Design a protein around this nucleic acid. Structure first.
Ligand SMILES: [Mg+2]
Ligand SMILES: [Mg+2]
Ligand SMILES: [Mg+2]
Ligand SMILES: [Mg+2]
Ligand SMILES: [Mg+2]
Ligand SMILES: [Mg+2]
Ligand SMILES: [Mg+2]
Ligand SMILES: [Mg+2]
Ligand SMILES: [Mg+2]
Ligand SMILES: [Mg+2]
Ligand SMILES: [Mg+2]
Ligand SMILES: [Mg+2]
Ligand SMILES: [Mg+2]
Ligand SMILES: [Mg+2]
Ligand SMILES: [Mg+2]
Ligand SMILES: [Mg+2]
Ligand SMILES: [Mg+2]
Ligand SMILES: [Mg+2]
Ligand SMILES: [Mg+2]
Ligand SMILES: [Mg+2]
Ligand SMILES: [Mg+2]
Ligand SMILES: [Mg+2]
Ligand SMILES: [Mg+2]
Ligand SMILES: [Mg+2]
Ligand SMILES: [Mn+2]
Ligand SMILES: [Mn+2]
Ligand SMILES: [Mn+2]
Ligand SMILES: [Mn+2]
Ligand SMILES: [Mn+2]
Ligand SMILES: [Mn+2]
Ligand SMILES: [Mn+2]
Ligand SMILES: [Mn+2]
Ligand SMILES: [Mn+2]
Ligand SMILES: [Mn+2]
Ligand SMILES: [Mn+2]
Ligand SMILES: [Mn+2]
Ligand SMILES: [Mn+2]
Ligand SMILES: [Mn+2]
Ligand SMILES: [Mn+2]
Ligand SMILES: [Mn+2]
Ligand SMILES: [Mn+2]
Ligand SMILES: [Mn+2]
Ligand SMILES: [Mn+2]
Ligand SMILES: [Mn+2]
Ligand SMILES: [Mn+2]
Ligand SMILES: [Mn+2]
Ligand SMILES: [Mn+2]
Ligand SMILES: [Mn+2]
Ligand SMILES: [Mn+2]
Ligand SMILES: [Mn+2]
Ligand SMILES: [Mn+2]
Ligand SMILES: [Mn+2]
Ligand SMILES: [Mn+2]
Ligand SMILES: [Mn+2]
Ligand SMILES: [Mn+2]
Ligand SMILES: [Mn+2]
Ligand SMILES: [Mn+2]
Ligand SMILES: [Mn+2]
Ligand SMILES: [Mn+2]
Ligand SMILES: [Mn+2]
Ligand SMILES: [Mn+2]
Ligand SMILES: [Mn+2]
Ligand SMILES: [Mn+2]
Ligand SMILES: [Mn+2]
Lengths: 119, 45, 44, 112
RNA sequence: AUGAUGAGGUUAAUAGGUUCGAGGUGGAAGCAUGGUGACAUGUGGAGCUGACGAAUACUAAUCGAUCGAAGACUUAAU
RNA sequence: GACAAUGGUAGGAGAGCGUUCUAAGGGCGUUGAAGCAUGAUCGUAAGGACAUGUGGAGCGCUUAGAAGUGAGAAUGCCGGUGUGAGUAGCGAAAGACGGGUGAGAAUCCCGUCCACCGAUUGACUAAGGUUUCCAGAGGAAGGCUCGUCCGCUCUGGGUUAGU
RNA sequence: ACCGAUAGUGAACCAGUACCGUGAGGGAAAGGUGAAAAGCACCCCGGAAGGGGAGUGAAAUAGAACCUGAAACCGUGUGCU
RNA sequence: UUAAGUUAUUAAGGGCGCACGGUGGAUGCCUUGGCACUAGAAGCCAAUGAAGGACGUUACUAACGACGAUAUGCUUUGGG
């Protein structure tokens, strides 16, 4: 429960950060945001791992629209990738489908950078 | 409120003894060369 | 707030012009003086 | 003899450069470069480039073995300073000093 | 506030996740039925649930570096 | 040789030091003048020499002459540099990631999502301003941070009326 | 027996100009490489800036923000503490 | 070793001295410009368009001068 901005803006940035990285398996961010986002993402992955329309309509409540370009032709949806792609990978896996990697400080403000990636 | 008397070179330096920066905790990359910050990533190799 | 000096080309040239100086004895005295100092601008 | 190099009028304030400089002073050239690369202050890359150039012409000029080299001495001196202002309340302006500094590094072997 | 104190650092439950639970809310969606409907009942103390409680190494506390004794002299007593 | 006197503000009296110039005499100087620096030197004081370093072309001494002739204080004037201090501040506001570029990206370009104004943060134009407009380069300084970017810099262009 | 760059003109420098005011008007700062540009070819670190060699020069510990280079002020080393 | 007593080393940092640097531009030396006078010339220019400017002129041209559309000059007499 860490913050940064205001309570709603925090929500927005969290849905944005969560939808991203589903979109692309890994992203670069502040260590603080990484530690916040990891929860929201593993949770979306359990909604995906349930499979029911209930938990789908439920994942929809947080996750952003996006578009996603599948390899070669055709277009998915971040939702569709949550349920129809990522969840397939993680069925046998218990909890914790996420890791934070410690990049160290960036130039502009010296904030500590980290990579956050899937398996 | 203002200082009522100027600080001497001596006072000002005594006030500065704790104003260093610590040398970063660091460690050698195993078989990669350039050293990195502790409990931090080994980079692209 | 409304500061003093709202520029106006016409009003600036009336009142403060070469011609406006010339129009009276004193304005000629002014141009005389500025010519004596040798202002690169003179009246403008 | 035991080689040196200098960078002049870098636009960082001398107080600031000196902080990074204290960590490096008296250290082996390799770990000096390490501490330099990891210390995340603004003067670190500048000081780094200076130490690099110093070891460089410590080899190409005086032909020392680079690995035995030590940071015999490092410091920064006040340079000329650019002077600017900063408008304030009630219409007063007030001074600002964009200070600059001469950084110096000198590497070494044994006495002769 | 920062430091500091304290709980831990794989011979590991320190946090996060996961599966449970307390407590909070009060009967989810989907379907079915009853209505012309607005709605109602059933499925079903349902669903959801931050900080609280357990269990579980699935994610992360990796590798590593720094500091830290060899014990002065005199006099009296074994 | 004895003997006497010698605290001192306003203030009176006296004798001197040093600075610039001038006159006359007499000298020093690239085998290194003035100046600057350092020193354990000398005289009762102001002050005077000597050695070493620096410096690179001028300068003392004696007698006299004349003065823009001596600084610590004027909330004195100008300039430099401190202290406060790595302190106050960085000027109303939602941003995130992916991909570029680059010596270097929180800050530049492209992209998706999100957000804010919408009798206006939109679209025109008068006043005023006078190349800030466009393109390609650039990054010292300006930009309250960064900068590969810019109302900044360089080079080259751009305003077409019988109604 | 006038000044010698805070002096002497406000102005030794493209001064009644930067700049300031609606205007009348007010009104600066800023001189010195060297005998000669001989103004550092070339190698090296750097994007550059800047620097170390190598050279020009009597000298660049005269290198352009360039004669001499005081003090305040800022630093690095240490003998006694 | 036990008891009683006595001393020291440590310098995070500071002080005095010294050495080597940086900033800054005093000081010395220098003078292109000033300052006060001396002797003599000279004491007016203008509608035949002045004083003072504006805009232009050069291979390249921003600025100062010079010059004007015959423009960074034209003819002419003399000097060189
Ligand atoms: Mg005048
Ligand atoms: Mg029905
Ligand atoms: Mg119940
Ligand atoms: Mg060790
Ligand atoms: Mg004793
Ligand atoms: Mg004398
Ligand atoms: Mg002598
Ligand atoms: Mg000599
Ligand atoms: Mg002396
Ligand atoms: Mg006399
Ligand atoms: Mg005074
Ligand atoms: Mg602080
Ligand atoms: Mg312009
Ligand atoms: Mg432009
Ligand atoms: Mg006289
Ligand atoms: Mg007025
Ligand atoms: Mg290179
Ligand atoms: Mg190169
Ligand atoms: Mg040389
Ligand atoms: Mg040289
Ligand atoms: Mg004892
Ligand atoms: Mg001890
Ligand atoms: Mg120390
Ligand atoms: Mg006459
Ligand atoms: Mn809201
Ligand atoms: Mn940067
Ligand atoms: Mn200190
Ligand atoms: Mn004037
Ligand atoms: Mn104002
Ligand atoms: Mn502890
Ligand atoms: Mn266990
Ligand atoms: Mn309950
Ligand atoms: Mn270890
Ligand atoms: Mn007396
Ligand atoms: Mn007496
Ligand atoms: Mn008297
Ligand atoms: Mn000689
Ligand atoms: Mn003299
Ligand atoms: Mn002499
Ligand atoms: Mn006087
Ligand atoms: Mn004074
Ligand atoms: Mn002052
Ligand atoms: Mn304070
Ligand atoms: Mn504070
Ligand atoms: Mn603050
Ligand atoms: Mn702002
Ligand atoms: Mn690239
Ligand atoms: Mn964008
Ligand atoms: Mn809105
Ligand atoms: Mn207009
Ligand atoms: Mn303007
Ligand atoms: Mn533009
Ligand atoms: Mn900037
Ligand atoms: Mn003057
Ligand atoms: Mn001078
Ligand atoms: Mn010359
Ligand atoms: Mn160069
Ligand atoms: Mn030579
Ligand atoms: Mn200077
Ligand atoms: Mn000099
Ligand atoms: Mn006369
Ligand atoms: Mn007439
Ligand atoms: Mn004329
Ligand atoms: Mn002829």
């Amino acid at each position: 429960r860490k913050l940064g901005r205001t309570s709603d803006q925090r929500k927005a940035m969290l849905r944005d950060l969560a939808t991203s990285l589903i979109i692309s398996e890994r992203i670069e961010t502040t260590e603080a945001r990484a530690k916040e986002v990891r929860s929201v993402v593993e949770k979306l992955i359990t909604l995906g791992k349930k499979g029911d329309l209930a938990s789908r309509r439920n994942a929809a409540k947080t996750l952003r629209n996006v578009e996603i370009l599948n390899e070669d032709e055709t277009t998915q949806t971040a939702l569709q990738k949550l349920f129809g792609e990522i969840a397939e990978r993680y069925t046998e896996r218990q909890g914790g489908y996420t890791r934070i990697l410690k990049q160290g400080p960036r130039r502009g403000d010296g904030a500590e950078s980290v990579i956050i990636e899937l398996v | 409120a203002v200082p009522k008397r100027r600080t001497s070179k001596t006072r000002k330096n005594k006030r500065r003894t704790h104003f260093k920066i610590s040398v970063p905790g660091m460690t050698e990359c195993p078989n990669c060369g350039r050293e990195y910050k502790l409990s931090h990533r080994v980079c692209k190799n | 707030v409304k500061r003093t000096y709202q520029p106006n080309k016409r009003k600036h040239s009336k009142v403060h012009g070469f011609r406006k100086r010339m129009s009276t004895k004193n304005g000629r005295k002014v141009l005389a003086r500025r010519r004596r100092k040798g202002r690169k601008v003179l009246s403008a | 003899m035991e080689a040196k190099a200098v960078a002049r009028t870098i636009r960082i304030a001398p107080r600031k450069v000196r902080l990074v400089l204290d960590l490096i002073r008296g250290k082996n050239a390799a770990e000096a470069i390490a501490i330099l690369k990891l210390t995340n202050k603004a003067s670190s890359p500048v000081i780094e480039k200076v130490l690099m150039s110093a070891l460089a012409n410590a080899e190409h000029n005086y032909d020392m073995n680079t690995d035995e080299l030590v940071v015999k001495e490092a410091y920064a001196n006040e340079g000329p300073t650019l002077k600017r202002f900063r408008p304030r309340a009630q219409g007063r302006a007030s001074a600002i000093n964009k200070r600059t500094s001469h950084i110096t590094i000198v590497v070494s072997d044994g006495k002769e």
